[PDB]
């Protein structure tokens, strides 16, 4: 894969907007939406909230896990534990990029949410290169990754698997 | 015709069509486009953007596209001349004009089918009434009265089309439209502010009108940016903020040093007379009266010590009363993006205006236009930050020309108007070869001159300037600027003079641009033209 | 102490950035410090009108908003009189503004916007009527100091002090007028029911045009046109609150579909202006007994359906436009609940109760209940229902 | 372009024109109406319209409805990205408003 398709899979998460136009139910091949009552919340998939925000037709809302207090506890829980701890949403990096870039003025304290998210990320990446070094160092044959999201996997996967194949080969070249 | 309301007459017609946008080349028109773009990319309206530069290229462009499309939009071009003939269109084609030039041509106003005008009629317009300009012995007895009518027409024309000026900028009409639809943002407000500031920078509007428009725009700025009353601590630092500033008139002083921006603003380079060693010490005394070390003033402004810059913008306004410079603070706006991004609305202008008019040419006429249209969106801060090193290089190569024609006295008093000319051998004179970057040099030359000369007559005569255009065709370019003063109405009158002079002498001339006061003339018809012009203006 | 007049949907005046009015049409905010004073108008539907920004030079402290105009008012000073300012943005002519000065020592205390008209209650105990274009209409005296004022169509909803209460209770009266071509005073200062030791928090009309109001104890009441113009509780916002300091700030009331649009407030009774609060949607629930049981649940649903469709009859009696399909769906919804309540009473061997429920049924539903009573061997019940069906046919 | 068809040996052109034809055969077989052209669509779709800017001359680009468009140099349009993908990926147009 590549980041630009993880970003595609991440635009299926649901968010809540507040439209300012009138429209009746829409029957999408992936569900139903609406109705859109001006000045009333409604829950849509991201790829539509962003596209409506760019055309000046809505007003986003911060997801509940995107609070500057619960995050300041996740950031500590992550540094205490010594394994991959569970995360608010399986796609938090892409949410807190797309949202904070496109709707940073409808989110209070954007430039602290952003730094806490980055602090969590910079740790969950450090635990990986330790869990991906003991693997080689001790020549394991299995490794249980607990709560890795698809993005951390995809940033260093096409190197790790490709450097473990060359190790299986070198380790089983004497049998015949 | 005149469009009464922009929603239901201009927008909601082209909302479902495929329009074609012709664009002139000036910061005002760039900023008037970049809003219409963002208003089309929001409603999925297929447009097309053709950058034109004269009348020949506008005609060439209309030649090719005139059968696919049948809607059109002209931006800062084609409101001071007649349109239904230079293009010779069909009947079912529609034209919208959103130009600033004045006065609007006559027929373009009594043609309510093909040429609609997006011009707010509450400007300074006084268009003559309809039949005053448009259509047995008793036969002759009444056709003599019709001859009287024609004679009155020949006069009222000369009354109405004698002075050219500019109205409210396009980037403010478009912004009114974009606010009606309720789809305005900060990014569409910064382009309004820049498209307004540019006119006042190039000195095409009066200070009264400029302050009136600033008074208008400040309500919008406060409506947007005040909603963050006390939450300015929990708003993202990486989100643009526009603010009203009462700030200095020095050009580019926040990127240049404080010293190289006093020697180059063509408002303190005139008063201080920073071209004559006798008055260069005036600058020294001005600096010494404030306690600014001569070693901090020479260093870049971002690196100056923090203890000096506390009340700089006040200790400069004060110590400029003691020298005869009381108009030193102006009213502008400024933008912050992030951690280190802080622009005044007259730095964006001097950078854009010099990305579009770079001397070294690298292709067709529409290769620089694109690179300057690029540097207005925040995703391209690497062009802006680059177009600020051209705007510097230009400003340091203008005070080294106004220093030539004032330590050599190349301003001839040819009678009713001053006169000058340039030499190729002087360095940095091929930079001003373009017929657009020559008006600013002349308009600063007049400001330095009027302050320099000791006469009382020359201080109130308009200037006329010529500099060589093409060595092969052997031709020069000529401009004409109104008589300078503090409260000049800014109503130039040379578009008629040059026309009638070339008509009298019957020489070769080209009125290629959209403004009339810029002409290309054979190097040999110079005097043949000039003498007849001297006699004509009288 | 008598509570002071207020505009429904507004936040207190002492706030630097406050809401002047928040209703179903839009929001009006006022930012006022010591340097400048600004008023911003926003519409929920951008197609109605563009965002309007005003320089509050006269220091307007009261505001109302409708699909027709913007209404603003300010008290008098030692130099200026109390003024009523209307921004008639929906006007089809070139004059979209008018202002009028009240007489000396007369101050505007409350305003409201109706369909094509505006009203202002003043410190002289006067109610002044104005057309939306600026014509002064009728004037009459108020029986007491005004508390709040609302308008909808031709209806004028006035709440005022009819007396002096004791032990924390207010003494409020309601004057309800219809200002059409035939002027009617629907309520001649009837006493306004309130929760004990509570004050008036919000008044107004539902989008369909029924008067409603909320007290400080979260009790939402609605005029019951089908019950002699009494007031029926339709919601209790305290049931959705988790603590004493939690409150709900009502914005609008809608009958079809049923929804109470309000702002959840944690720690205070009104939401802060920034950041933009989110509008919550609460359901209506009439305070019926044993609502956890199937009988009480269906009885609440039935009477909630009855009261929230009285507006259809009101629109019909006054020539307004109503959907006949909504009236038919209401009856079908009610006949289904009656039929399920009759089947429940039949299972409980309460056959007398079944006949009582059948009295509320249509003739077709009663005929169906007779065959359901013949089934399951309820012979006497079937006879009582048949005699009821005969009596219903005789009433025609 | 014949900067390429000049470097292939004269029998590789036959392999090509066979492969291309078999591919265009398979593609039209997927769906009922002329299948689905899987050659386009190389990157996830982001928005519905795109803003291009020409870079070389090109005779007369077509819009499905017979409404052609001339392509001079340095002249930017606003077209549906459903049509511009073929040309952006070659070098003619350019996606500016990223």
Give the domain extent around A117.
Answer: 67-175
Q: Which of these three, A66, A87, A110, is where a domain ends?
A: A66
Burial class of residue A66, CB neighbours in 10 A (0-12, 13-18, 19+): buried
> What gap in Å lies between CA B202 and CA B211, rounded to an integer?
15
Residues A79 and A108 in one domain: yes
Q: Which of C304, C322, C300, C325 is nearest to C313 (CA)?
A: C322
One domain, residues A60 and A73: no
* Alpha carbon of A101: minimum distance to chain D alpha carbons (Å): 14
Element holding B187 (H helix, E strand): helix B187-201
Q: Does A50 share its domain with A85?
A: no
Cβ contact, residue pair C46, A106, below 8 Å: no
Same domain? For A82 and A153 the reply is yes
| CATH code assigned at A119 | 1.20.58.1020
The CB density around residue B232, as the number of other CB atoms within 10 Å, is: 11
| Under 8 Å between Cβ of B479 and B439 | yes
Residue C300 DSSP class: H
* CB atoms C46 and B223 under 8 Å: no
Q: What is the distance in angstroms between the Cα of B314 and the nearest Cα belonging to chain D? A: 42
Asked whether residue A60 falls in the same domain as residue A83, the answer is no
State whether A26 and A58 are in the same domain.
Answer: yes
B120 touches chain C (CB under 8 A): no
Half-sphere exposure of C172 (CA within 13 A, CB side): 30
Task: Write out the E strands in D1-87.
Answer: 49-50, 58-61, 69-71, 76-77, 79-80
Q: Are C262 and C249 in contact (CB under 8 A)?
A: yes
User: To which H or E segment does residue B197 belong?
Assistant: helix B187-201
Among A42, A66, A90, the domain-final residue is A66
Clarify whether residues A16 and A40 are in a common domain.
yes
Using the beta-carbon criterion (under 8 Å), do A111 and B183 form an inter-chain contact?
Answer: no
Query: What is the CATH number for A38?
Result: 3.40.5.50
Burial class of residue D13 (count of CB atoms within 10 Å of its CB; 0-12, 13-18, 19+): exposed
- List Cβ neighbours of A45 (8 Å cut-off, separation of 6 or more): A11, A12, A13, A14, A15, A30
Q: Which residue of A has its CA nearest to C27?
A: A39
Listed residues A21, A46, A66: the one ending a domain: A66
Measure CB to CB from residue B219 to each of C50, C53, C273 and give the nearest one.
C53
A81: number of Cβ within 10 Å: 12
Classify each residue of B73-105 as buried b or exposed e, where b means 16 or more C-beta atoms within 10 Å of its C-beta: bbbbbbbbbebeeebebeeebbbbbbbbbbbbb
DSSP B329-351: EEEEEEEE-SSS-EEETTTHHHH
Bridge partners of C353, per DSSP, are none
- Total domains, chain A: 2
Question: Do A61 and A143 share a structural domain?
Answer: no
C134 phi-psi bin (left φ>0, alpha ψ -120 to 50, beta other): left
Residues from chain D that touch B68, judged by Cβ atoms under 8 A, are 67-70
Which residue in this structure is represented by tokens 């106003």? B109
Q: Which of B329, B325, B296, B298 is nearest to B313 (CA)?
A: B329
Q: Do A8 and A62 have their domain in common? A: yes
* A62 and A85 inside one domain: no
Do A102 and A162 fall within a single domain?
yes
List chain A gaps (C–N > 2.5 A) by preceding residue.
none
Q: Which chain A residues are Cβ-neighbours of C46 within 8 angstroms? A: 20-21
Chains D and C are touching, with contact defined as 3 or more CB–CB pairs separated by less than 8 Å = no
Which of helix, strand or coil describes residue A60? coil
Which residues have C-beta within 8 Å of that of residue D7, sequence separation ≥ 6? Answer: none
Asked if A8 and D47 come within 8 Å (Cβ–Cβ), the reply is no
Residue D2 at interface with chain B, using a CB cutoff of 8 Å: no
How would you class B342 by CB atoms within 10 Å of its CB: exposed for 0-12, middle for 13-18, buried for 19 or more?
Answer: middle
Separation CA D25–CA D19 (nearest Å): 10
The strand pairing partners of B333, in sequence order, are B244
Same domain, A76 and A40: no
């Amino acid at each position: 894969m590549d980041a630009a398709e993880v970003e595609f899979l991440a635009e299926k998460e649901l968010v809540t907007i507040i439209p300012n136009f009138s429209l009746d139910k829409i029957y999408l091949i992936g569900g139903d939406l609406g109705p859109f009552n001006p000045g009333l919340p409604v829950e849509v998939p991201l790829w539509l909230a962003i596209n409506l925000k760019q055309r000046q037709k809505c007003r986003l809302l911060p997801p509940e896990w995107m609070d500057v207090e619960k995050l300041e506890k996740m950031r500590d829980h992550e540094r205490k534990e010594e394994t991959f701890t569970p995360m608010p949403s399986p796609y938090y990096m892409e949410l807190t990029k797309l949202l904070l870039n496109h709707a940073s003025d409808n989110i209070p304290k954007a430039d602290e949410i952003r730094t806490l998210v980055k602090d969590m990320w910079d740790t969950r990446i450090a635990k990986l290169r330790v869990s991906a070094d003991s693997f080689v160092r001790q020549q394991e044959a299995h490794a249980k990754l607990d709560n890795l999201t698809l993005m951390e996997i995809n940033t260093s996967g096409t190197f790790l698997t490709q450097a473990l194949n060359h190790m299986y080969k070198l380790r089983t070249n004497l049998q015949p | 015709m005149f469009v009464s309301d922009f929603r239901k007459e201009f927008y909601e017609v082209v909302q479902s069509q495929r329009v074609l946008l012709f664009v002139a080349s000036d910061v005002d028109a760039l900023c008037a486009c970049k809003i219409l773009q963002a208003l089309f990319q929001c409603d999925h309206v297929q447009y097309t953007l053709v950058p034109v530069s004269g009348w020949q290229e506008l005609e060439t462009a209309f030649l090719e596209h005139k059968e696919q499309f049948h809607y059109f939009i002209l931006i800062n071009c084609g409101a001071n001349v007649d349109l239904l003939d230079i293009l010779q269109p069909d009947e079912d084609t529609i034209f919208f004009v959103c130009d600033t030039h004045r006065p609007v041509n006559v027929v373009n106003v009594y043609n309510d089918t093909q040429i609609k005008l997006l011009i707010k009629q509450d400007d300074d317009l006084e268009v003559p009434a309809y039949e005053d300009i448009f259509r047995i012995v008793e036969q002759t007895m009444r056709r003599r009265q019709r001859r009287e009518w024609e004679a009155r027409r020949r006069d009222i024309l000369f009354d109405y089309e004698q002075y050219e000026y500019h109205g409210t900028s396009s980037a403010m009409v478009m912004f009114e439209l974009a606010w009606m639809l309720s789809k305005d943002l900060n990014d569409m407000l910064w382009w309004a502010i820049v498209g307004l500031t540019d006119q006042w920078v190039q000195d095409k509007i009066t200070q009264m009108k400029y302050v009136t428009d600033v008074g208008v725009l400040q309500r919008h700025v406060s409506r947007h940016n005040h909603r963050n009353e006390d939450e300015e601590n929990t708003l993202s630092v990486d989100c643009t903020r526009i603010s009203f500033e009462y700030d200095l008139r020095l050009v580019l002083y926040q990127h240049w040093s404080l010293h190289d921006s006093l020697c180059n603003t063509s408002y303190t380079a005139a008063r201080f007379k920073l071209w004559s060693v006798h008055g260069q010490k005036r600058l020294q005394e001005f600096l010494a009266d404030m306690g600014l070390p001569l070693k901090q003033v020479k260093q870049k402004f971002q690196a100056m010590d923090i203890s000096l810059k506390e009340n700089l913008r006040e200790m400069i306004e004060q110590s400029a009363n003691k020298f005869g410079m009381k108009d030193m603070r102006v009213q502008t706006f400024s933008i912050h993006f992030g951690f280190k991004h802080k622009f005044l609305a007259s730095d964006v202008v001097f950078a854009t205006m010099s990305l579009m008019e770079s001397p070294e040419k690298d292709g067709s006429g529409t290769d620089h236009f694109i690179q300057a249209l690029d540097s207005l969106s925040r995703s391209n801060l690497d062009k802006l930050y680059h177009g600020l090193e051209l705007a510097k290089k230009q400003l340091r190569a203008t005070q080294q020309t106004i220093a030539s024609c004032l330590c050599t006295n190349l301003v001839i008093s040819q009678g009713p108007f001053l006169y000058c000319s340039l030499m190729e051998g002087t360095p940095d004179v091929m930079l001003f070869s373009r017929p657009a970057s020559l008006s600013l040099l002349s308009k600063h030359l007049l400001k330095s001159f009027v302050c320099s000369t000791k006469n009382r007559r020359c201080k109130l005569l308009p200037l006329v300037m010529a500099a060589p255009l093409s060595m092969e065709h052997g031709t020069v370019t000529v401009v004409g600027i109104p008589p300078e003063t503090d409260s000049s109405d800014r109503k130039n009158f040379f578009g008629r003079a040059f026309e009638k002079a070339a008509e009298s002498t019957s020489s070769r001339m080209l009125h290629n641009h959209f403004d009339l006061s810029v002409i290309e003339l054979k190097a040999e018809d110079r005097s043949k033209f000039l003498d007849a012009l001297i006699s004509l203006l009288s | 102490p008598r509570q002071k007049p207020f505009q429904s949907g507004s936040t207190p005046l002492h706030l630097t950035h406050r809401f002047m009015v928040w209703n179903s049409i839009g929001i009006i905010r006022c930012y006022n410090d010591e340097q400048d004073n600004a008023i911003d108008v926003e519409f929920h539907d951008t197609s109605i009108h563009h965002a309007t920004h005003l320089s509050n030079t006269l220091n307007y402290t009261i505001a109302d908003l409708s699909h027709e105009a913007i209404l603003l008012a300010c008290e008098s000073t030692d130099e200026l009189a109390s003024k009523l300012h209307c921004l008639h943005f929906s006007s089809w002519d070139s004059s979209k503004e008018w202002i009028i000065d009240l007489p000396q020592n007369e101050d505007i205390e409350a305003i409201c916007l109706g369909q094509g008209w505006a009203a202002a209650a003043t410190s002289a105990l006067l109610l002044r009527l104005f057309t939306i274009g600026g014509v002064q209409k009728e004037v009459f005296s108020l029986a007491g100091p005004v508390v709040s004022m609302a308008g909808h169509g031709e209806q004028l909803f006035i709440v005022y002090h009819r007396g002096t209460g004791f032990d924390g209770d207010q003494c409020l009266g309601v004057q309800l007028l219809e200002l059409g071509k035939k002027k009617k005073q629907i309520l001649h200062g009837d006493p306004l029911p309130l929760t004990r030791k509570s004050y008036l928090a919000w008044i107004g009309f539902s989008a369909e045009g029924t008067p409603c109001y909320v007290d400080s104890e979260g009790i939402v009441r609605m005029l019951n046109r089908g019950l002699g113009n009494t007031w029926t509780p339709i919601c209790n916002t305290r049931e959705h609150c988790k603590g004493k300091s939690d409150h709900y700030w009502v914005v609008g009331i809608h009958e079809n579909p049923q929804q109470l649009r309000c702002i959840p407030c944690k720690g205070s009774r009104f939401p802060p202006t920034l950041p933009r609060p989110a509008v919550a949607i609460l359901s209506f629930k009439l305070p019926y007994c044993q609502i956890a049981t199937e009988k009480g649940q269906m009885e609440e649903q039935f009477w909630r359906s009855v009261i929230f469709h009285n507006h259809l009859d009101y629109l019909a009696k006054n020539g307004y436009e109503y959907e006949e399909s909504t009236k038919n769906q209401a009856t079908k919804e009610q006949q289904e609940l009656l039929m399920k309540m009759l089947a429940l009473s039949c299972k409980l061997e309460r056959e007398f109760r079944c006949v009582e429920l059948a009295d509320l049924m249509t003739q077709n539903a009663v005929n169906l209940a007779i065959k359901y009573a013949s089934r399951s061997r309820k012979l006497i019940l079937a006879q009582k229902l048949s005699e009821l069906a005969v009596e219903k046919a005789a009433e025609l | 372009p014949n900067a390429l068809r000049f470097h292939m040996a004269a029998e590789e052109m036959e392999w090509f024109n066979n492969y291309k034809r078999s591919l265009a055969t398979y593609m039209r077989s997927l769906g009922g109406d002329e299948g689905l052209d899987i050659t386009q669509d190389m990157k996830p779709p982001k928005s519905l319209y795109i803003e291009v800017r020409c870079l070389k001359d090109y005779g007369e680009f077509e819009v499905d409805d017979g409404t052609s468009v001339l392509l001079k140099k340095n002249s930017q349009h606003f077209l549906p990205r459903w049509k511009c993908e073929q040309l952006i990926r070659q070098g003619v147009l350019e996606h500016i408003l990223s």
